[PDB]
Design an enzyme around this catalytic site. Structure first.
Site, PDB file in Angstrom:
ATOM      1  N   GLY D  30       0.800  -1.203   0.000  1.00  0.00           N
ATOM      2  CA  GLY D  30       0.000   0.000   0.000  1.00  0.00           C
ATOM      3  C   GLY D  30       0.843   1.269   0.000  1.00  0.00           C
ATOM      4  O   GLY D  30       2.070   1.247  -0.061  1.00  0.00           O
ATOM      5  N   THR D  31       0.142   2.398   0.070  1.00  0.00           N
ATOM      6  CA  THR D  31       0.806   3.693   0.089  1.00  0.00           C
ATOM      7  C   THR D  31       1.547   3.895   1.405  1.00  0.00           C
ATOM      8  O   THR D  31       1.079   3.483   2.470  1.00  0.00           O
ATOM      9  CB  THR D  31      -0.209   4.817  -0.117  1.00  0.00           C
ATOM     10  OG1 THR D  31      -1.199   4.765   0.917  1.00  0.00           O
ATOM     11  CG2 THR D  31      -0.889   4.676  -1.472  1.00  0.00           C
ATOM     12  N   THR D  32       2.709   4.536   1.328  1.00  0.00           N
ATOM     13  CA  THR D  32       3.550   4.722   2.500  1.00  0.00           C
ATOM     14  C   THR D  32       3.039   5.865   3.371  1.00  0.00           C
ATOM     15  O   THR D  32       2.419   6.819   2.889  1.00  0.00           O
ATOM     16  CB  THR D  32       5.000   4.987   2.086  1.00  0.00           C
ATOM     17  OG1 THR D  32       5.835   5.016   3.251  1.00  0.00           O
ATOM     18  CG2 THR D  32       5.120   6.311   1.344  1.00  0.00           C
ATOM     19  N   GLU D  47       1.788   9.720   2.204  1.00  0.00           N
ATOM     20  CA  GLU D  47       1.976   9.945   0.775  1.00  0.00           C
ATOM     21  C   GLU D  47       0.945   9.112   0.026  1.00  0.00           C
ATOM     22  O   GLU D  47       1.024   7.878   0.017  1.00  0.00           O
ATOM     23  CB  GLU D  47       3.394   9.579   0.342  1.00  0.00           C
ATOM     24  CG  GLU D  47       3.677   9.842  -1.129  1.00  0.00           C
ATOM     25  CD  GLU D  47       5.090   9.468  -1.530  1.00  0.00           C
ATOM     26  OE1 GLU D  47       5.837   8.951  -0.673  1.00  0.00           O
ATOM     27  OE2 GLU D  47       5.454   9.690  -2.704  1.00  0.00           O
ATOM     28  N   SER D  75      -1.701   2.216   6.527  1.00  0.00           N
ATOM     29  CA  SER D  75      -1.130   1.818   5.243  1.00  0.00           C
ATOM     30  C   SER D  75      -1.484   0.358   5.006  1.00  0.00           C
ATOM     31  O   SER D  75      -1.023  -0.523   5.739  1.00  0.00           O
ATOM     32  CB  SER D  75       0.383   2.025   5.221  1.00  0.00           C
ATOM     33  OG  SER D  75       0.937   1.599   3.989  1.00  0.00           O
TER      34      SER D  75
END
Lengths: 233, 233, 241, 243, 243, 242
Positions: D30-32, D47, D75
């Site tokens: 996933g997104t950090t 982010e 995340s």
């Protein structure tokens, strides 16, 4: 295909349910090919020694360079194909090493290949999910159950054989028969000619065709059949 | 294919994914194609109806939620009525308790909480129906893209259905066009008609195959079916 | 309790739980019956494998649901009790609720309706029992013989058999018996039932049980001595003809 | 025998759990998102990877706020991350009813710790494959916690998760050694965006969007809110200047 | 067939696989802890291992306080530890409410053992991967130590031990009780039993601990507290000066 | 052996996917919706000559103006009609009117999704979805005569001429060129029996087939054996002419 500059599919996929005549399509291509055809048994690759199965794989691909423009065929690849994991058997690592040699000889470091490779089995579920991934296989064709229009031509190709009474419509016979495998469809025409012996008939009539519906289908409904029995295992 | 874990939604794959969630996404990908977009003061949805026969009718792909908002149908048709009932209850719950219209941003989190309980527990299943939530509130016009995986993100416009992602190229080049069109419902709907036309493959848009619903400030949610959309063809 | 659904559709469209339940009847005792003009008869056999069975304290193969209507089951003798007990409670319930005696058509739809629930209810199995409901509606002399299949499908039959050797008796009832011209006397209905049991019971006496149902709430079960009287007359007209 | 990885409650012969290990692998897909702990509060940063130009800017809220002073960022899978916040909101609301004054940060971690662990004990439900980072300003000092899929958590002076978790956590150790005595809340806002750009080397193939929300007693005085106005653009030019 | 090793049922060898696999999950953290019973009290010492600098040592604790008269020390994964910690506090406070007074140490280890068996005998849940060790001083037997287990069998020990080196710790401590023929330490002061257990812990483990490398719980009569980093460091200095 | 909610890589469910193929295992129900009425018909499919024609009824009556027919396995049909008759008559109690044919179909099609094990949030107990296909016909004061189809998949389509069961392919293709908007009620009765004569295994008569109709005045009506026999004699004149 050389005009467009494309890559023809190296492998194919034919599995389907048991009894659809899959092996008939394998022998039909070998007739039009007019070249060397190789049929490999799933139990032939595994030998009586440990490690000899790896030599059996190199035996097949060595003749590909010797004999150009041939066709190799694998029958019942499930007993060959890997991804049996490990736990609890302790001996499952002997079967997976055959595929690791088979995959390496198929797609290796040097991209060596010429002819077409055919994988055929009745158990798509137990196959290696990496084996089903593309690049070793492109065209994927799974046989299905013929519909009313599909099963109609099954009795028409068999009408040229045996004895058929003039004026009999085979579309009503295939309609009364439900969806089933092609192996049970040819058994209808085979048994239809067997009623004239006991029932004292000259040629097979429409009355003897209705008896085959309750015999070949309704009478044999107890085991001894697939008819979409095994979807996975 | 058809391996690893097909059994339940509560078992994680070794690759860090969920097969049952990925299989639910395939229903929208192969489902009925539809597009959509929105402006500052208005929002327009366009759907393409299908059927199994020429003599049959065409089911509505847009179900009216309230006067100020609605949704669209994609993927699994019968599972739309389940989420539509739970959504209309929340819209009426806010009017009978908070006396306020349900916002589009808060409406996405309500449907996300209903689909997450079936994926995290046995016996339930994620609804594979696609939903495009449009509406107008004091903030402005908003559009959402609902997926069985639980992804809710506000967009200017999107397309879900069969070969629907191929129509998003027209929305990107025109992205700077329809966003500046305010108070012009005629030219705004034509932007969505040209978007779905890029996804047309076999047939084209007809009188009964075109379903357009528009919502805005001065113009409430209205479903245009039959010959009402014949002027935008 | 147990919420897991046992009934699963086969890829051909059939059901394993429903299809395999039909063979519990084909392995059970043969239950055959016929109906005349003013009368109806339901016959049944008994297993000759075990002896020393007291007839008086043995439950009859044909259970009495009410005065004007009875029930004759076959196949499994276990699951048949659940259908009989719930049908008798509904007989008193329908008599209490609507203040009307139960009919043969309503009793058949109830017994078949209960079987349709277990097929559609998760956590239970369907009945492997096929029951034959026959009787006379109130103020009606026309006999109603309805077949109840384990799958939940009900139908009316003038002469029908269930259980082992069914195809042998069905072919016998389609020739020597006519649906358009049934017998007008009770004696001819009893002799036809005995002949249908000769191809299954295979020369036996205490293994044959025949129950005669008559209108005006009259139920007379033929004893062991009365059944043998018809057997003697048939055997003399069989080998000699 | 095979099947150790079929179910949840089944223990592996090595002493691990496959359903727990596979849930951790979904965290790195996933997104950090990162975080920074200060003396008077904590700072959250995330982010969000932008897919196409169709995304409307700043209309997607990655950091969900529980009660007021308790922020939450996750995340991993979207529904698994939103379910913990929706469950944690009911825990913070039910606490203030009986217990009056709001729940502190270290006490709120016990609500999610037992709730996530209850999913691993039964095969009827599945654990959460999302890593939730929550914190804020409690009654005494401040605390920051990162909820793992296994349910294990401790006090974190810094937190890193997502695809860039490898390169983002290495930069958190430099911030601790830079200011070992203490770090102001205003300086950590610009340092949070700088670490994201240093971890963007792995995510550089797509578009990024900066979202930062901080809480402390110096300015907001016990209020967890996002960053709007020229303060967000000031942290962008300061972080991109060193690149 | 092959499901005997998945859910708890009688095995063809007459054993329980899931119970045996549960002992391998207690050492996942690999933390050695020992406790000796003083004359008027009982002291426990556990290793404090902080893997990352981002973790706050004050927030990280493997020793939980159930009540003022009852301490608890857990060796294993923290998520299964905090799940049993919040549950043990609910059953301990229920005794004071229902029965009117404070629960002793043997009863709390008995109720949690029968509760841990519910996690075993029931096939739809899994046993805890932690070992609850309760340290308390009762009003009758005085100092006592009872060690639980995922199988649900509680038993009292003189000097309890855990970890992978437990075999080296138990053997080293066995020679002290067999030679002196005493069931408890004769030191009256609670400060002497702290330094006594550290001496035998260093020689057995072959490691010189620091102020942040240990967590020393102290259970006195009707009082329980955990020594901070300053109190643990103070004891280590006096040992090197005297011995 | 798996759950009833299990999805397939094809994007569809297991279970119900097979119920769609179970429709061809039964009889063939054919119906045509015209402007003067809707003519429905079924096939009794008697396996023995001793079966009573009045016994098997595949066409029930939900309302005086609304009626349907069943095909395939009839075990699941009775359970749907009990709720279909209930939802239609109970709607008469609330709104003091007759429920629309399209509105009633949406309530009946919701019963196919009730399969599941241990449903959360409410109590829904079903072992297997309904494997029976229903053709919902009727008339209202707005859209006029409507003929729907209740699929096990949970959806529905409004057909002008529909053939289900074993005639979903051969008999359905004939309805394309044989249907017209000006088709009357009398000519539609002989058109249905025209296809039923060819698709039937045995000879067509009153005992092997039962047809019904739905009009504006009389509403739902079942053709008597005398009325059906008169249409069979007129069918022979329409077959062989020139």
């Amino acid at each position: 295909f050389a005009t467009l500059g494309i890559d023809p599919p190296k492998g194919i996929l034919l599995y389907g349910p048991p009894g659809t005549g899959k092996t008939l399509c394998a022998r039909a291509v070998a007739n039009r090919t007019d070249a060397t055809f190789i049929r490999v048994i799933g139990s032939e690759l595994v030998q009586k020694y440990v490690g000899e199965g790896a030599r059996m794989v190199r035996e097949l691909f060595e003749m590909a360079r010797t004999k150009k423009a041939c066709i190799i065929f694998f029958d019942e690849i499930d007993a060959v194909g890997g991804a049996r994991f490990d736990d609890g058997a302790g001996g499952d690592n002997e079967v997976q090493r055959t595929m690791l040699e088979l995959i390496t000889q198929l797609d290796g470091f040097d991209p060596r290949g010429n002819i077409k490779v055919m994988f055929a089995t009745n158990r798509p579920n137990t196959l290696d999910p990496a084996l089903l991934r593309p690049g070793r296989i492109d065209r994927k064709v799974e046989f299905s159950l013929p519909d009313l229009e599909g099963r109609a031509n099954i009795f028409r190709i068999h009408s040229k054989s045996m004895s058929v009474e003039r004026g009999i419509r085979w579309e009503l016979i295939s309609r009364l028969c439900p969806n089933s495998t092609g192996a049970e469809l040819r058994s209808v025409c085979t048994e239809a000619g067997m009623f004239a012996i006991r029932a004292r008939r000259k040629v097979a009539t429409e009355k003897d065709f209705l008896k085959a519906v309750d015999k070949v289908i309704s009478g044999y409904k107890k085991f001894s059949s697939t008819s979409r029995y095994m979807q996975y295992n | 294919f058809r391996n690893n874990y097909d059994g339940d939604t509560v078992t994680f794959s070794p690759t860090g994914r969920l097969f049952q969630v990925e299989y639910a996404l395939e229903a929208i990908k192969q489902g009925s194609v539809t597009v959509g977009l929105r402006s500052n003061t208005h929002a327009v949805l366009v759907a393409l109806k299908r059927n199994a026969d020429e003599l049959s009718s065409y089911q509505k792909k847009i179900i009216k939620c309230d006067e100020h908002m609605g949704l669209s149908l994609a993927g699994l048709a019968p599972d739309a009525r389940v989420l539509s009932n739970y959504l209309r209850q929340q819209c009426n719950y806010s009017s009978l308790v908070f006396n306020r219209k349900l916002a589009v941003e808060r409406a996405g989190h309500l449907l996300c909480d209903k689909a997450q309980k079936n994926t995290q527990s046995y016996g339930g299943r994620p609804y594979g129906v696609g939903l495009l939530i449009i509406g107008y509130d004091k903030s402005g016009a908003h559009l959402l893209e609902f997926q069985p995986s639980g992804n809710v993100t506000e967009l200017y416009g999107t397309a879900i259905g069969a070969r629907s992602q191929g129509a998003k190229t027209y929305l990107e080049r025109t992205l700077d066009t329809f966003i500046k069109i305010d108070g012009n419902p005629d030219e705004l709907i034509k932007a969505g008609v040209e978007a779905i036309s890029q996804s047309l493959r076999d047939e084209s848009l007809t009188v009964d195959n075109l379903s357009i619903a528009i919502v805005g400030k001065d113009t409430p949610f209205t479903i245009y079916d039959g010959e009402a959309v014949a002027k935008y063809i | 309790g147990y919420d897991r659904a046992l009934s699963i559709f086969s890829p051909d469209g059939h059901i394993f739980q429903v299809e395999y339940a039909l063979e519990a009847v084909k392995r059970g005792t043969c239950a055959v019956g016929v109906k005349g003009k003013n009368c109806v008869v339901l016959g049944c056999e008994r297993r000759s494998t075990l002896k020393l069975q007291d007839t008086r304290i043995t439950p009859s193969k044909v259970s009495k649901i009410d005065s004007h209507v009875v029930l004759s089951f076959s196949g499994l003798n276990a699951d048949s009790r659940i259908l009989i007990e719930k049908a008798r409670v509904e007989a008193q319930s329908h008599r209490l609720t609507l203040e009307d005696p139960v009919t043969v058509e309503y009793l058949t739809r109830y017994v078949a309706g209960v079987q349709q629930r277990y097929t559609q209810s998760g956590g239970v199995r369907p009945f492997g029992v096929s029951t034959l409901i026959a009787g006379f509606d109130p103020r009606d002399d026309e006999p109603k013989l309805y077949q109840t299949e384990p799958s939940g499908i009900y139908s009316s039959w003038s002469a029908q058999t269930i259980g082992r050797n069914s195809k042998t008796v069905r072919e016998f009832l389609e020739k020597n018996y006519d649906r358009k011209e049934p017998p007008a006397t009770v004696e001819e209905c009893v002799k036809l039932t005995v002949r249908s049991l000769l191809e299954v019971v295979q020369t036996g006496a205490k293994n044959i049980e025949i129950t005669v149902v008559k209108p005006d709430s009259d139920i007379v079960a033929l004893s062991s001595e009365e059944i043998n009287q018809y057997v003697t007359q048939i055997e003399q007209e069989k080998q000699e003809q | 025998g095979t099947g150790y990885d079929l179910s949840n409650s089944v223990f592996s012969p090595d002493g691990r759990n496959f359903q727990v290990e596979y849930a951790v692998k979904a965290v790195e897909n996933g997104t950090t998102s990162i975080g920074i702990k200060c003396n008077d509060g904590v700072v959250f940063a995330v982010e969000k990877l932008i897919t196409s130009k169709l995304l409307v800017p700043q209309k997607n809220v990655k950091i969900q706020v529980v009660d007021r002073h308790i922020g939450c960022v996750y995340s991993g899978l979207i529904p698994d991350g939103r379910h913990l916040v929706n469950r944690g909101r009911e825990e913070a609301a039910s606490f203030k009813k009986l217990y009056k004054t709001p729940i502190p940060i270290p006490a709120f971690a016990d609500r999610l710790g037992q709730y996530v662990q209850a999913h691993t004990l039964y095969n009827s439900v599945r654990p959460f494959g999302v890593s939730t980072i929550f914190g804020g300003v409690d009654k005494n000092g401040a605390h920051l916690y990162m909820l793992e899929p296994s349910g294990s958590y401790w006090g974190y002076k810094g937190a890193a998760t997502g695809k860039g978790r490898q390169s983002a956590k290495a930069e958190l150790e430099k911030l601790v050694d830079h200011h070992p005595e203490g770090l102001s809340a205003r300086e950590a806002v610009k340092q949070a965006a700088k670490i994201i750009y240093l971890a963007h080397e792995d995510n550089k193939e797509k578009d990024f969007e900066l979202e930062i929300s901080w809480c402390s007693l110096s300015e907001t005085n016990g209020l967890h809110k996002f960053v709007k106005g020229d303060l967000l653009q000031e942290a962008i030019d300061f972080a991109q200047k060193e690149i | 067939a092959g499901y005997d090793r998945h859910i708890t049922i009688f095995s063809p060898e007459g054993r329980l696989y899931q119970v045996e696999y549960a002992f391998k999950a207690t050492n996942q953290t690999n933390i050695n802890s020992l406790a000796v019973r003083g004359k008027d009290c009982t002291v426990v010492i556990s290793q404090k291992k902080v893997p990352d600098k981002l973790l706050d040592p004050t927030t990280v604790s493997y020793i939980f306080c159930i009540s003022r008269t009852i301490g608890m020390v857990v060796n294993g994964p923290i998520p299964d530890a905090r799940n049993a910690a919040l549950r043990a506090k609910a059953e301990a406070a229920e005794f004071r409410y229902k029965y009117g007074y404070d629960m002793p140490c043997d009863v709390l280890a008995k109720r949690m053992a029968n509760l841990s068996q519910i996690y075993t005998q029931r096939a739809y849940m899994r046993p805890l991967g932690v070992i609850l060790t309760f340290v308390s001083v009762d009003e009758e037997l005085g100092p006592s130590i009872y060690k639980t287990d995922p199988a649900g069998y509680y038993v009292g020990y003189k000097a309890t031990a855990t970890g992978p080196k437990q075999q080296e710790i138990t053997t080293n401590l066995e020679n002290h009780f067999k030679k002196s023929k005493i069931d408890h330490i004769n030191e009256e002061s609670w400060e002497k039993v702290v330094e006594f257990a550290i001496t035998h812990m260093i020689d057995a483990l072959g490691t010189e601990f620091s102020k942040n490398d240990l967590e020393v719980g102290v259970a006195t009569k009707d009082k329980f507290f955990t020594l901070s980093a300053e109190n643990i460091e103070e004891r280590l200095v006096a040992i090197a000066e005297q011995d | 052996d798996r759950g009833v909610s299990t999805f397939s890589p094809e994007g569809r469910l297991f279970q119900v996917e097979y119920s769609l193929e179970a429709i061809k295992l039964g009889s063939t129900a054919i119906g045509i919706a015209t402007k003067e009425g809707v003519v429905l018909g079924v096939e009794k499919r008697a396996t023995s000559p001793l079966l009573e024609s009045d016994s098997i009824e595949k066409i029930v009556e939900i309302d005086r103006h609304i009626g349907c027919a069943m095909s395939g396995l009839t075990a699941d049909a009775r359970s749907m009609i009990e709720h279909a008759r209930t939802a239609a008559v109970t709607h008469n109690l609330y709104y003091d009117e007759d429920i629309n044919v399209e509105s009633l179909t949406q309530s009946v099609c919701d019963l196919a999704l009730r399969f599941g094990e241990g449903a959360s949030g409410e109590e829904r107990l079903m072992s297997r979805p309904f494997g029976v296909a229903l053709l919902i016909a009727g008339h209202d004061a707005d859209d006029g005569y409507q003929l729907f189809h209740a699929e096990p998949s949970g959806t529905f389509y409004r057909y002008n001429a529909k053939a289900i069961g074993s005639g979903s392919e051969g008999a359905q293709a004939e309805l394309l060129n044989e249907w017209h908007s000006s088709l009357t009620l009398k000519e539609a009765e002989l058109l249905v029996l025209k296809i039923l004569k060819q698709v039937m295994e045995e000879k067509l008569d009153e005992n092997n087939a039962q047809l019904s109709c739905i009009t504006k005045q009389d509403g739902f009506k079942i053709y008597d054996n005398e009325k059906t026999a008169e249409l069979i004699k007129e069918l022979k004149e329409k077959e062989a002419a020139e």
